[PDB]
Design an enzyme around this catalytic site. Structure first.
Site, PDB file in Angstrom:
ATOM      1  N   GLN A  19       0.794  -1.198   0.000  1.00  0.00           N
ATOM      2  CA  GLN A  19       0.000   0.000   0.000  1.00  0.00           C
ATOM      3  C   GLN A  19       0.836   1.262   0.000  1.00  0.00           C
ATOM      4  O   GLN A  19       0.325   2.349  -0.232  1.00  0.00           O
ATOM      5  CB  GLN A  19      -0.928   0.006   1.192  1.00  0.00           C
ATOM      6  CG  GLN A  19      -0.244   0.142   2.481  1.00  0.00           C
ATOM      7  CD  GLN A  19      -1.245   0.297   3.560  1.00  0.00           C
ATOM      8  OE1 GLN A  19      -1.745  -0.688   4.094  1.00  0.00           O
ATOM      9  NE2 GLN A  19      -1.583   1.539   3.873  1.00  0.00           N
ATOM     10  N   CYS A  25      -5.320   1.214   3.089  1.00  0.00           N
ATOM     11  CA  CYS A  25      -5.534  -0.174   3.461  1.00  0.00           C
ATOM     12  C   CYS A  25      -6.999  -0.551   3.375  1.00  0.00           C
ATOM     13  O   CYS A  25      -7.331  -1.712   3.201  1.00  0.00           O
ATOM     14  CB  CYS A  25      -5.038  -0.438   4.866  1.00  0.00           C
ATOM     15  SG  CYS A  25      -5.802   0.625   6.059  1.00  0.00           S
ATOM     16  N   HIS A 162      -7.033  -0.318  10.960  1.00  0.00           N
ATOM     17  CA  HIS A 162      -6.513  -0.979   9.776  1.00  0.00           C
ATOM     18  C   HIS A 162      -7.630  -1.721   9.016  1.00  0.00           C
ATOM     19  O   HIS A 162      -8.678  -2.040   9.587  1.00  0.00           O
ATOM     20  CB  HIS A 162      -5.388  -1.937  10.212  1.00  0.00           C
ATOM     21  CG  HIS A 162      -4.494  -2.404   9.104  1.00  0.00           C
ATOM     22  ND1 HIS A 162      -4.514  -1.863   7.839  1.00  0.00           N
ATOM     23  CD2 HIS A 162      -3.547  -3.370   9.086  1.00  0.00           C
ATOM     24  CE1 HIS A 162      -3.628  -2.486   7.079  1.00  0.00           C
ATOM     25  NE2 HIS A 162      -3.030  -3.402   7.813  1.00  0.00           N
ATOM     26  N   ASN A 182      -2.450  -9.158   4.656  1.00  0.00           N
ATOM     27  CA  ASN A 182      -2.002  -7.808   4.951  1.00  0.00           C
ATOM     28  C   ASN A 182      -1.535  -7.132   3.649  1.00  0.00           C
ATOM     29  O   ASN A 182      -1.119  -7.809   2.704  1.00  0.00           O
ATOM     30  CB  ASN A 182      -0.875  -7.873   5.989  1.00  0.00           C
ATOM     31  CG  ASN A 182      -0.613  -6.558   6.647  1.00  0.00           C
ATOM     32  OD1 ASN A 182      -1.238  -5.567   6.317  1.00  0.00           O
ATOM     33  ND2 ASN A 182       0.295  -6.542   7.599  1.00  0.00           N
TER      34      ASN A 182
END
Ligand SMILES: CN1CCN(C(=O)N[C@@H](CCCONC(=N)N)C(=O)N[C@H](/C=C/S(=O)(=O)c2ncccn2)CCc2ccccc2)CC1
Length: 215
Positions: A19, A25, A162, A182
């Protein structure tokens, strides 16, 4: 529910992205959910674009952050369900600055017609995830920048900061866990992934869970 699920082994999940120094995110989470809901819908694995969201979704705040529910909402309402390929709307926000919106040059890579919002219940989230696939989830990632590997079991869990993707879990294990994509490189965590404990609302993972619905 099955004792373990990993949607990656059925190849449903795209390569782990990056990212950049950009709080996008929420976009990576959402798009990852879409890539997965679109694969499983009988269509081929296609890399979709977070840049579309970051630059165009005005219902959220680009590199400053945002929600996944709003991302889905926007895609379906303003963009008539259409999500572009990544190749034709590539990511250009690796430096905390997001390009403005562009409307030509791209190619539609998927369709969604809505999204669902999951019960704040880890077990139902899990069951659902076994039946329908990978889920966008909001989390507290405060203790995360120090994660190298394993089942993290001592999560700071107080504020959601997140946006990541649940790709599976395991319940047979000594410490039951979630399996989490992730958007920080594969050079982070367990090759881009983290496992945290399943069963105690680690990292407030049962909180804001949702998924785009392809069909
Ligand atoms: C009004 N308001 C504020 C903005 N916002 C938001 O930021 N939401 C989160 C998503 C979590 C979803 O649910 N949360 C809750 N219901 N409370 C978000 O977008 N977090 C981003 C990236 C952080 S990151 O870890 O991915 C990262 N950033 C930079 C470098 C590396 N990694 C935070 C955005 C950000 C934060 C600080 C500085 C810059 C950017 C929605 C609601």
């Amino acid at each position: 529910a099955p004792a373990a699920v990993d949607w990656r082994a059925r190849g449903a999940v795209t390569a782990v992205k990056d990212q950049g120094q950009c709080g996008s995110c929420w976009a990576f989470s959402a798009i990852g959910n879409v890539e997965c809901q679109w694969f499983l819908a009988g269509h081929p694995l296609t890399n979709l674009s977070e840049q579309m969201l970051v630059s165009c979704d005005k219902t959220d705040s680009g590199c400053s952050g945002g929600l996944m529910n709003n991302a889905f909402e926007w895609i379906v309402q303003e963009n008539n369900g259409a999500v572009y390929t990544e190749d034709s709307y590539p990511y250009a926000s690796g430096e905390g600055i997001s390009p403005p919106c562009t409307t030509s040059g791209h190619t539609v890579g998927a369709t969604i017609t809505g999204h669902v919002e999951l019960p704040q219940d880890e077990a139902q989230i899990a069951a659902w995830l076994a039946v329908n696939g990978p889920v966008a989830v909001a989390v507290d990632a405060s203790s995360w920048m120090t994660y190298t590997g394993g089942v993290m079991t001592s999560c700071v869990s107080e504020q959601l900061d997140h946006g990541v993707l649940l790709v599976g879990y395991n319940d047979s294990a000594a410490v039951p866990y979630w399996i989490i994509k992730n958007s920080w490189t594969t050079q982070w965590g367990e090759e881009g992934y983290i496992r945290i404990a399943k069963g105690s609302n680690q990292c407030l993972v049962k909180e804001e869970a949702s998924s785009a619905v392809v069909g």
